[PDB]
Structure 1
Amino acid sequence: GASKLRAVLEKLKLSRDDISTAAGMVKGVVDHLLLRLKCDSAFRGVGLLSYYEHVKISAPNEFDVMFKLEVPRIQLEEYSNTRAYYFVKFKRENPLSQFLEGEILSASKMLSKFRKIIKEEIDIVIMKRKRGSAVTLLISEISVDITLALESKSSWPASTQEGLRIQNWLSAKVRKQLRLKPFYLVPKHAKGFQEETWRLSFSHIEKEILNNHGKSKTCCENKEEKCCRKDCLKLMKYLLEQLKERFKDKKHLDKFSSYHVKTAFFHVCTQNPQDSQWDRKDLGLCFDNCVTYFLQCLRTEKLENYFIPEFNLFSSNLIDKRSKEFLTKQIEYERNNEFPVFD
């Protein structure tokens, strides 16, 4: 019954076309903000990490952008064996020294000035406060979440050593090339709460793996090699967002995000490395297997971060068992009934 799936994919592509003008508005504001920010000595190396992303596939007018800032000769200290959260210290003048709180970089000090500079130039289209990762701009009745990210061109942290298990899918050579790219750190407090910590971010790798996703270099570049990998992820994200909207009056689904669906999907890509396992003619079965994998993650309360295998996104310290059970029931309901939430 993939035809209803194809209908959803049809209407998602229409809303993407109808938004292209809004993306141009975001580019104009973002470039303007960036020009101002590079005049400040603390944010001289600021730059864009495309130019935008859509955390919510069903909200085409809500944009997400990342501003990166390179931190040379960074030294990381893992917070409380969390594998993903770190204090930032410097090895050796330092343009970020005004942000130190002792020997660690203060995320609170950095965000405070970041928020202030953006406030000064938004001389332009309002700006909204965040609930660390920093501000939400509203543009001409279009919202743009801006995240600040430190960039490190050093070897990835040791907690990633066993992650990104793409060797049998995208190749060991590609894994080597990707792990030579930088990694990013976004301000994120760790749970009272531990402030001044930063969380690893690999959004740039996730984008690369999704847009260059086949074992074949020519996957999806011709008729004989069209796969349905991207469409399966679109439909998984749309399923979660529709369930989150339908049950927004309950607390049960608040903690689930497109990141969980995306992580599960990357694991499915690892389990199913051959392009022939993703023939676009099998979209119905491919999507069902994606849903099924996500459900197994929910039931077992195991969803390893794709880059940091010891970090369990579905730990009961993060999402209570009752919420996963609720999501499990609702997805199983949808699947048994040809996804009424897609109507």
Structure 2
Amino acid sequence: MGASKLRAVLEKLKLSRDDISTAAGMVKGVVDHLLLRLKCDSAFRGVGLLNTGSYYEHVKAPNEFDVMFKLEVPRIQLEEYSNTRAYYFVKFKRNPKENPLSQFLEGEILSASKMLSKFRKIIKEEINDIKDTDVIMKRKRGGSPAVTLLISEKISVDITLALESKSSWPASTQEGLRIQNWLSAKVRKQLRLKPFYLVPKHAKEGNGFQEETWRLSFSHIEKEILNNHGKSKTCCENKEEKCCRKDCLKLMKYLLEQLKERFKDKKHLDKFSSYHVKTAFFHVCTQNPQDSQWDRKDLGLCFDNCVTYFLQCLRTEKLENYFIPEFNLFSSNLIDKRSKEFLTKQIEYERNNEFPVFDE
């Protein structure tokens, strides 16, 4: 695929500032309401919106949003669950006083499900009485840490509770975030000085879930490297330094979206998500650390790079969490071989036919 061809695909996907800002305005209204309602509970007194510029997650298009509600909690003490590397039990270093989160304490262990339940119940209670905006809560999605809302039958919002820890990141992330040769060792240090988050997504335990466990999240870091993405500090600030990194990611996401859409009737692509694509993309960024390897005229080659890497990940059934290297997002235990073989074949068909998926 030629570079100009690929950018013509993105150009026709570009949304009008009006349709975007209207969409953003609706979710902000709902979010503002939920935040203040939430503050009426002592346990969520500390809730606040984490890292949101309210830019949508779908390319097409401005109908889906992903928000995290960060909760500042006292010094946290983690205990890794069954060496899963990403899931943890949360305990408090000092709990002699009857904590505000004490109601969610099952033993010395802060229950993810109990918090998630109340969080959800509080939100569901304010959804009936929202002024001027029609809002509905979606069914619980299997295994999701998120409360999903649908605004005006058009806009989906994922609202995810997020415990904030200012402690240093857990050992499982020691070899993660390999950005040294790309964004530099000192950027990695400064990033790792920032807080990490815990969302109420439970580890698998037999036919069910270990309902107390939380999972690590670094969406704030993911946000930072996407918007400050070059080896050069002035990457994408002038004509002579315009790179195609953001375009590649968009095209990879739109490819996955379109395929998921085409084959909704089948079940094969249901477990794949833009998070897989974003992760695959970060790895490619690490493999191609130079801004010259992401030249604007090379969008064609760079996109194929991303496609090819993603394909290798599907075939070998290995896609490392960018922050937690021993967590395999593509293990056969999460996504079975057939689904990955199906996605593999469709992407390959697309590439061999000049991406019919990319035209209207």
Query: What TM-score range do you get, normalising by the shorter chain?
Result: over 0.9
Per the normalisation by structure 2, the TM-score is 0.90
Query: For residues 95-126 of structure 1, what are the alpha-carbon distances to aligned partners after superposition, in whole Å with 9 as ceiling and x for unaligned?
Result: 101101111111121112111221222xx722
CA 1:330/1:17 → structure 2, altered by over 3 Å: closer, same or farther? farther
Q: What's the offset of the Cα at 1:18?
A: 2.4
Structure 2 CA distance for aligned equivalents of residues 160 and 182 of structure 1: 13
Q: 1:77 aligns with which of 73, 76, 79?
A: 79
Query: For residues 268-313 of structure 1, what are the alpha-carbon distances to aligned partners after superposition, in whole Å with 9 as ceiling and x for unaligned?
Result: 0001111011011111111011101111111111111100001111
Query: For residues 177-210 of structure 1, what are the alpha-carbon distances to aligned partners after superposition, in whole Å with 9 as ceiling and x for unaligned?
Result: 0000010111112222221111100000001000
Q: How does 1:117-136 map to 2 (within 5 A)?
A: 117-121=122-126, 125-131=135-141, 133=144, 134-136=146-148
Comparing 183-192 and 271-280, the one that deviates more: 183-192
Check the 8 A contact 1:33/1:118 in 2, yes or no: yes
- Percent identity at matched positions? 100
Comparing 5-14 and 239-248, the one that deviates more: 5-14
- Matched residue SS, 1:19: helix
CA 1:48/1:164 → structure 2, altered by over 3 Å: closer, same or farther? same
Check the 8 A contact 1:83/1:159 in 2, yes or no: yes
Check the 8 A contact 1:15/1:60 in 2, yes or no: no
Per the normalisation by structure 1, the TM-score is 0.95
Check the 8 A contact 2:315/2:340 in 1, yes or no: yes
Check the 8 A contact 1:303/1:314 in 2, yes or no: yes
Check the 8 A contact 1:51/1:65 in 2, yes or no: no
Q: CA RMSD in A?
A: 1.6
CA 1:157/1:52 → structure 2, altered by over 3 Å: closer, same or farther? farther
Comparing 124-133 and 140-149, the one that deviates more: 124-133
Name the residue aligned to 1:86: 88
Structure 2 CA distance for aligned equivalents of residues 98 and 170 of structure 1: 43
Check the 8 A contact 2:111/2:212 in 1, yes or no: yes
- Matched residue SS, 1:151: strand
Structure 2 CA distance for aligned equivalents of residues 7 and 162 of structure 1: 39
Check the 8 A contact 1:304/1:313 in 2, yes or no: yes
Structure 1 CA distance for aligned equivalents of residues 256 and 16 of structure 2: 18
Check the 8 A contact 1:54/1:64 in 2, yes or no: no
Q: What's the offset of the Cα at 1:11?
A: 2.0
Check the 8 A contact 2:55/2:65 in 1, yes or no: no
- Matched residue SS, 1:129: coil
CA 1:280/1:51 → structure 2, altered by over 3 Å: closer, same or farther? closer
Structure 2 CA distance for aligned equivalents of residues 51 and 183 of structure 1: 22
Comparing 243-252 and 219-228, the one that deviates more: 243-252
Q: What's the offset of the Cα at 1:24?
A: 0.9
Structure 1 CA distance for aligned equivalents of residues 184 and 118 of structure 2: 42
- Matched residue SS, 1:173: helix
Name the residue aligned to 1:2: 3
- Matched residue SS, 2:100: coil
Check the 8 A contact 2:314/2:341 in 1, yes or no: yes
Structure 2 CA distance for aligned equivalents of residues 140 and 45 of structure 1: 29
Structure 1 CA distance for aligned equivalents of residues 59 and 139 of structure 2: 18
Structure 2 CA distance for aligned equivalents of residues 53 and 240 of structure 1: 13
CA 1:225/1:51 → structure 2, altered by over 3 Å: closer, same or farther? closer
Q: What's the offset of the Cα at 1:135?
A: 1.9
Q: 2:183 aligns with which of 149, 170, 176?
A: 170
Check the 8 A contact 2:203/2:213 in 1, yes or no: yes
Gaps of 5+ in 1: none
Check the 8 A contact 2:112/2:213 in 1, yes or no: yes
Structure 1 CA distance for aligned equivalents of residues 91 and 210 of structure 2: 16
CA 1:17/1:306 → structure 2, altered by over 3 Å: closer, same or farther? farther
CA 1:16/1:157 → structure 2, altered by over 3 Å: closer, same or farther? farther
Structure 1 CA distance for aligned equivalents of residues 210 and 293 of structure 2: 44
Check the 8 A contact 2:56/2:65 in 1, yes or no: yes
Q: What's the offset of the Cα at 1:53?
A: 4.7
Q: What's the offset of the Cα at 1:3?
A: 3.1
Check the 8 A contact 2:56/2:62 in 1, yes or no: no
Q: What's the offset of the Cα at 1:38?
A: 1.6
Q: How does 1:221-232 map to 2 (within 5 A)?
A: 221-232=237-248
Structure 2 CA distance for aligned equivalents of residues 186 and 206 of structure 1: 16
Q: What's the offset of the Cα at 1:55?
A: 8.9
Query: For residues 225-266 of structure 1, what are the alpha-carbon distances to aligned partners after superposition, in whole Å with 9 as ceiling and x for unaligned?
Result: 000000000000000111111111112111111111111100
Gaps of 5+ in 2: 127-133
Check the 8 A contact 2:198/2:216 in 1, yes or no: yes
